[PDB]
Amino acid sequence: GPWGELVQLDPQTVGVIVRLERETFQVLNMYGKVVTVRHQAVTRKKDNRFAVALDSEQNNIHVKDIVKVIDGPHSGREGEIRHLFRSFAFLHCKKLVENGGMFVCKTRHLVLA
Template identity: 55%
Template sequence: MCYCLVLVESTTIKDNTHFFAPGDNVEVTEGELVNLRGKVVSVDGPKVVMMPDHEELKEPLTLNISELRKYFRPGDHVKMISGRYEGDTGLIVRVEHNLVVVLSDLSMDEMKARPRDVQLCADITTGVDSLGQFQFHDLVQLDQQNVGVIVRLEKETMEVLNQHGKVLRVKPQAIQGKKDTRHSQALDSQQNPIQCRDMVKIIDGPFAAKKNEEEKQGEIKHVYRSWVFVYSRKHVENGGMLVCKARHLLLIGARAGTTRSMKTPLMVLSP
């Protein structure tokens, strides 16, 4: 198998003291072993123990941190260890000049970071904020009149898609609380009651399919009054989350002109 290896930025002692870790893929940048590649075994101050990837070198080597730089393969799974996206994980999709572009496991958005802020990682982020209060895709109360769904969790802030389709960056302390919408319902375009976990088609409004486009559909995550938050894998923005009016939706499996019987009374969230 042939891998396309992309080398990224030389590193300094200051940078690497904090950001090199066992398991990192590295390349020697100077001295007799220049271009030798290997994997970090341990880091001790300004020294790195590296296991070389070379058939004639079977023993670990100790090198100065300043002699090494990281390299990544497209397809490597990594974790953001500092910066704006700290704690997020994803897949490297490409490497640009002194930047790696990572596709987030949670939001499916692209994140750009310096290689020194990235580390190889097998785990996938849980989508829980640093205080453990909120999760990815929670519906939260922003103020007395507005709610929104969390579409990105960052180190100190979160991005929330409100019921009007706007993305706001807020601090967790500003959130008034979470909303439980498991039993909330609304009526779709054919007066069918729809609720959390129902699969729906978007047949009207700004997200309806244009001419020659495939019809967009998704799973209802939350119902709030006449607004419905729908998760669609084909929606590339905001981690696949979009918000629609209930009347712009059609319950999948329901036929036009018919209604699904209501097993429970229609419930609408109070402010």
């Protein structure tokens, strides 16, 4: 299903679907804001499950990795990398009730746990 899937919001912006409504999705965009969009206003984006990035200590990080957040708004949190880009990642932590556990951090604000 579409929950937790990566979508293209506009040519520059990606997000992750975090709530399903009858005509719309709530989408957590790559900037950390939640937007409401009609189901057809976003396109399904091909996940790159083999993405690699650098964390704050220059470790290679990958999808499925457990990281700690050491800077930025979510500093102190811990999460699982769900979608990974060179500069940011969408993470999940089940203890976070906000946005179904999803949140977004810069990769340089992460360290492999």
